[PDB]
Design a protein around this ligand. Structure first.
Ligand SMILES: O=P(O)(O)O[C@@H]1O[C@H](CO)[C@@H](O)[C@H](O)[C@H]1O
Ligand code: NA
Length: 219
C-alpha cells in the first residue's frame, strides 16, 4: 500500500489557479503583452513566480532591466495576495476535506509539494494546516518544477520514499515532476491539457481513498 499522498495546492485543493491566471494576464497587458490567454496559461501552472514572469517576457522576446523584473514580479504578487484575502473553508474543492480525514484515519502521511510561496497562508485561510504532516519549502530546493526536487523533499519530510507515494496535480510541469520523482501521478483536469498516458479524473470529487488504493493496486 502507499504510505504518503503529496498534494499540489493551486487547482487541486482550491481554485487559486484562476486567480494566478487573472493576475498574470493583467500584468502582461500593462506592459503591452497580449498573448496570456487560457491556453498559454497552461505553461504558467505549477512553475515558480520567476519562471512564470520569464515565460511571459519571452512571448514577445521582450527585454526589461533586472530592476524592472523585480518590480513586475512584486506588482503581480501584491495583486494576487489582495485577491486571496477572503478565501475561506467554503472554497475547499469537493472531496478534498473528506480525503484528508480518511488518509489521517488510515495513518497515511500528508504533505504539500507546491512551488507557491503563498501555500502556508492559503492552508491557514482554509483551516487545513492541522491535516498536513509537512509543507515542503519551495525556496529550499535547488531546482523548481518541472524538476522532481519538491516532490522528493515532500516525501522525505514525512519519512517515506517517493516510490511509496502518490502525487496529485492539475499542471503539466507538476505531472512531469511527479514522473521524475518515482511517485505515482494522478491528475485532475482535461486529458487535452495533461495527457492520455497517466490516470486523470475530471474533478476532485473523484479523489477518494478507495479510488487511490485501486490505482495503486493496478499500477
Ligand atoms: O507567486 P507564488 O504564489 O510564489 O508562485 C505561483 O506558483 C503557482 C503554482 O506553481 C504558479 O502557477 C504562479 O504562476 C506563481 O506566481
Ligand atoms: Na484560518
Amino acid at each position: 500500500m502507499f504510505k504518503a499522498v503529496l498534494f499540489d495546492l493551486d487547482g487541486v485543493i482550491t481554485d487559486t489557479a484562476e486567480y494566478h491566471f487573472r493576475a498574470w494576464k493583467a500584468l502582461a497587458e500593462e506592459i503591452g503583452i497580449n498573448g496570456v490567454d487560457r491556453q498559454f496559461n497552461e505553461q504558467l501552472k505549477g512553475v515558480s513566480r520567476e519562471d512564470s514572469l520569464q515565460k511571459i517576457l519571452d512571448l514577445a522576446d521582450k527585454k526589461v532591466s533586472a530592476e524592472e523584473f523585480k518590480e513586475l514580479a512584486k506588482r503581480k504578487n501584491d495583486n494576487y495576495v489582495k485577491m486571496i484575502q477572503d478565501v475561506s473553508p467554503a472554497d475547499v474543492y469537493p472531496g478534498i476535506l473528506q480525503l484528508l480525514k480518511d488518509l489521517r484515519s488510515n495513518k497515511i502521511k500528508i504533505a504539500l509539494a507546491s512551488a507557491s510561496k503563498n501555500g502556508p497562508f492559503l492552508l491557514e485561510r482554509m483551516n487545513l494546516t492541522g491535516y498536513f504532516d509537512a509543507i515542503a519549502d519551495p525556496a529550499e530546493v535547488a531546482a523548481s518544477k518541472p524538476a522532481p526536487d519538491i516532490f522528493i523533499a515532500a516525501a522525505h519530510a514525512v519519512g517515506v520514499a517517493p516510490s511509496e507515494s502518490i502525487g496529485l496535480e492539475n499542471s503539466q510541469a507538476g505531472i512531469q515532476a511527479i514522473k521524475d520523482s518515482g511517485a505515482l501521478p494522478i491528475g485532475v483536469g482535461r486529458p487535452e491539457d495533461l495527457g492520455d498516458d497517466i490516470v486523470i479524473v475530471p474533478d476532485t470529487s473523484h479523489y477518494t481513498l478507495e479510488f487511490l488504493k485501486e490505482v495503486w493496486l493496478q499500477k
